Amino acid sequence: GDTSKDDWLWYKQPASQTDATATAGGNYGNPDNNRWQQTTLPFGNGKIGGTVWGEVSRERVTFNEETLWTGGPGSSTSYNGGNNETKGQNGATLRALNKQLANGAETVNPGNLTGGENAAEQGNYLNWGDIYLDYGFNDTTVTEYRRDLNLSKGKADVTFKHDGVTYTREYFASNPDNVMVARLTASKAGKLNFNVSMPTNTNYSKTGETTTVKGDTLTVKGALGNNGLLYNSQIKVVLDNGEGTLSEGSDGASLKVSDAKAVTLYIAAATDYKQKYPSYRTGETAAEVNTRVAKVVQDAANKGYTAVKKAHIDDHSAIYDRVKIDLGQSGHSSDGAVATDALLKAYQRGSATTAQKRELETLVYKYGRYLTIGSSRENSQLPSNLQGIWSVTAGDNAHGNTPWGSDFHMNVNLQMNYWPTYSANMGELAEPLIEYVEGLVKPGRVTAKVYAGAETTNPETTPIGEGEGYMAHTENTAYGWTAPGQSFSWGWSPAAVPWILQNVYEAYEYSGDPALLDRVYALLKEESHFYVNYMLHKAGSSSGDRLTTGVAYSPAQGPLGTDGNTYESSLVWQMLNDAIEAAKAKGDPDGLVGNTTDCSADNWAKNDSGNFTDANANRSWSCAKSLLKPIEVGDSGQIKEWYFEGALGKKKDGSTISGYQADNQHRHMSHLLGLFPGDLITIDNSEYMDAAKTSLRYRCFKGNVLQSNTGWAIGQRINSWARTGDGNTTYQLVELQLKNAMYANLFDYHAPFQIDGNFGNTSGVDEMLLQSNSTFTDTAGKKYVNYTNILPALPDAWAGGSVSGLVARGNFTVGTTWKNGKATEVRLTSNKGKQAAVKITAGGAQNYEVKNGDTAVNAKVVTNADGASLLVFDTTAGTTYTITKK
Ligand SMILES: [Ca+2]
Numbered sequence: 001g002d003t004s005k006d007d008w009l010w011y012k013q014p015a016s017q018t019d020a021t022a023t024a025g026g027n028y029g030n031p032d033n034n035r036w037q038q039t040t041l042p043f044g045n046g047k048i049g050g051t052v053w054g055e056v057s058r059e060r061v062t063f064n065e066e067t068l069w070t071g072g073p074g075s076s077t078s079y080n081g082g083n084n085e086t087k088g089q090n091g092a093t094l095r096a097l098n099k100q101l102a103n104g105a106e107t108v109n110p111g112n113l114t115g116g117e118n119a120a121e122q123g124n125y126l127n128w129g130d131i132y133l134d135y136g137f138n139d140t141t142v143t144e145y146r147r148d149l150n151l152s153k154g155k156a157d158v159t160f161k162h163d164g165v166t167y168t169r170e171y172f173a174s175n176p177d178n179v180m181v182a183r184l185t186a187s188k189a190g191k192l193n194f195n196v197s198m199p200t201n202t203n204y205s206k207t208g209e210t211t212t213v214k215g216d217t218l219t220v221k222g223a224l225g226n227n228g229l230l231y232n233s234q235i236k237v238v239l240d241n242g243e244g245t246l247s248e249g250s251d252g253a254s255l256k257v258s259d260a261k262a263v264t265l266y267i268a269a270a271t272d273y274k275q276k277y278p279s280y281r282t283g284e285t286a287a288e289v290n291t292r293v294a295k296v297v298q299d300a301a302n303k304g305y306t307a308v309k310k311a312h313i314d315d316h317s318a319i320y321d322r323v324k325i326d327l328g329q330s331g332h333s334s335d336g337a338v339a340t341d342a343l344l345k346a347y348q349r350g351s352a353t354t355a356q357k358r359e360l361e362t363l364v365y366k367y368g369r370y371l372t373i374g375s376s377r378e379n380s381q382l383p384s385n386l387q388g389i390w391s392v393t394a395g396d397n398a399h400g401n402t403p404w405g406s407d408f409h410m411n412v413n414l415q416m417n418y419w420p421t422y423s424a425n426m427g428e429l430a431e432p433l434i435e436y437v438e439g440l441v442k443p444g445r446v447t448a449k450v451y452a453g454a455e456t457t458n459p460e461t462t463p464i465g466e467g468e469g470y471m472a473h474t475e476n477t478a479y480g481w482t483a484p485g486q487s488f489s490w491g492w493s494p495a496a497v498p499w500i501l502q503n504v505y506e507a508y509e510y511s512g513d514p515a516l517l518d519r520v521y522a523l524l525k526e527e528s529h530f531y532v533n534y535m536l537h538k539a540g541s542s543s544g545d546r547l548t549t550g551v552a553y554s555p556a557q558g559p560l561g562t563d564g565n566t567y568e569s570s571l572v573w574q575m576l577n578d579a580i581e582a583a584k585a586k587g588d589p590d591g592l593v594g595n596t597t598d599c600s601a602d603n604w605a606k607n608d609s610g611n612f613t614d615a616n617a618n619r620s621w622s623c624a625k626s627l628l629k630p631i632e633v634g635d636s637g638q639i640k641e642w643y644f645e646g647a648l649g650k651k652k653d654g655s656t657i658s659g660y661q662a663d664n665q666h667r668h669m670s671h672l673l674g675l676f677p678g679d680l681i682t683i684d685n686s687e688y689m690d691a692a693k694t695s696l697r698y699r700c701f702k703g704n705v706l707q708s709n710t711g712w713a714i715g716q717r718i719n720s721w722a723r724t725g726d727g728n729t730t731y732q733l734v735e736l737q738l739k740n741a742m743y744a745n746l747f748d749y750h751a752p753f754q755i756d757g758n759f760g761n762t763s764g765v766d767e768m769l770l771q772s773n774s775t776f777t778d779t780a781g782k783k784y785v786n787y788t789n790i791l792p793a794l795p796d797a798w799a800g801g802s803v804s805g806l807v808a809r810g811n812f813t814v815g816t817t818w819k820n821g822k823a824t825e826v827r828l829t830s831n832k833g834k835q836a837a838v839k840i841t842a843g844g845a846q847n848y849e850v851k852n853g854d855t856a857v858n859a860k861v862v863t864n865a866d867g868a869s870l871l872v873f874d875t876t877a878g879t880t881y882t883i884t885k886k
């Protein structure tokens, strides 16, 4: 085909010869594993993944399947989600601690709020192994070598000339046909000779593994030692025209292909995992999995390469091509095009041209969308983990050979994985996250009982929404590991659930979809019930006059075990906000919205049995929300991180806060979640926004110099800065992520490789060009909720450009063209007919007018007390409105 217009990451040498000189990080002491993370090119179908090395002779595709997880039922005889009954005492331990805080304690020792001690029960995500395609060349001398990742077509390509013959390789993983394809060619008949093997990683425990050949198919199968999970992979080799010979390798164990010209390999893998509490198994036998995997490769071969490839590209491109961004970038087809590793190095050196700078920025942005398609499909069994689905490291136990188990880290990281999912028009890719959080409900009720005394009768059978609450913490797995971890500071964080419910609720916010409303309403209802009934209390003297969440830590500074904090109260505020919105949208069938009549923190008074002593008092969602008072501006003009805080880093009396990083540059900004991702601190509130900008500047600058960071920290700061409207600072953060936190394969790093920052980048660029989360209040006091904000934080660096296919809440598809730093055209497609309300930050919307083609729309200009303006107008589903300067 014509690929000149496609987006490529491309390299002029194999992975083995690609620069892997950036910081390796923990677990990457093996030069070979470090080389994997910095140089290989990922692809996937949401379920299986490969990372292509592009080696000339011993070619290698590191292989993953999303469900290959140790831990869980079968890892012990008593697996119970890590919950420690002796520590939790059915809520008694937490209750006693909160009473101390209520009676005036500033801090308590939260040391016994722990669990999850058994690393075998926790487990971790495993690298499955490798596909090795050994051409058995005498040397690796080549010319005209290239390897690429075609982001537009979802496939990896390798080409080179060796001893008069041109060898090509193409790799993709089809979602529609559930199968990995390797298309391999030589330019001369009989010159394609290779050995096919697929060894499982040797660093995890396996029982009864066998490798059998039954040309045309190689099968590896066994069960995991740690938990008995059955696994099965197969490679079917189809000689393209039955030309060439298929034999068995001398080792076992491999398939040899001789004297061929071209072949297609069909690769499949599965386990008997099911996301289903409490057994987490399909109930299949090994033979039954073997048969299932066999049907995948056979079906694909019956379809054939042309049809499978066509179906793959149609499917991949349908999602990939929804968004287009032009900031003036060069690309792989440009005259004087630069390979992607050389591009990164030029960007780091300061010698990249404007076009090349825009190419790197724009490629990293696109890669975040690409990586979502590869790791998180609407039919994936699990959401993307700390590494999407791609890993090379393996070991049996949690906190072992793989950094943080490549797990589901739900106190910023899993959240970040789903920051760009809706705004960058990949909404259905959020489905496995929604299903994952749904999946936490049953096991989470066990935790909620043990640690907070919220008992759901028969947690297994009680529908989501009808139980007493579900609790989960930071480290999560495939197996309902909802217990807190073994040390409080990093292990305990029940507001992780509220937080991930933002990602979930946004699936409804951006779509208006009725079936999603029911699902998000059920999750929000039970979690809001949980907080109102079991987690909120009237604060003691240290935290002023308010309900707080009680025993808390602000990751990861200050005192352990304070009386609530801004981080948690901001999250609980948002959750109640969204639960109320969801209930209103349903006609508040359960009568839970209530009001603020006779509403007081005293209404939460409990006896020693945990029962309310004023049982019939108002504890409705509206009342509880109103009592949080999450944002308090402190004596330094900052957002307080603690309710006992005065000036920054100090208590009200001027003494210093212990555990506060006194240089003011603590890496986390847990108290700013109301600015991003939430709706608590917005451009529409200058008091709060000015204070949030003050907090951000203290955290992010040393002197007047903006500081670099990596991984999730830089991703969070880009998005947080975007919400302020400071496009220039936001952009300088983007530059700093590209310079200091991207490997040659554009994997984001911490170090080591962590995918969160890849997805965070894509989201941050979205939030520069379009915001949709805030609420505008006009001079008449009318609210415009989730108004469309065009170019809210456009950097001066991007003087002109266009973007199309972004999504705004209310379900509008948005395109924008700008020149000389100001919008020239907005194209707003109303997908659901919701009333439009449009701010034009780069232009002033009062200077614009609205048309439906030739029809002039009678848009009204409304303005707020601060003198900013919205264009408001009714819309019809399916219609595009063009907004242009008068
Ligand atoms: Ca997945």
Ligand SMILES: [Ca+2]
Pocket (backbone or CB within 6 Å): 509, 679, 773
């Ligand atoms: Ca919202």
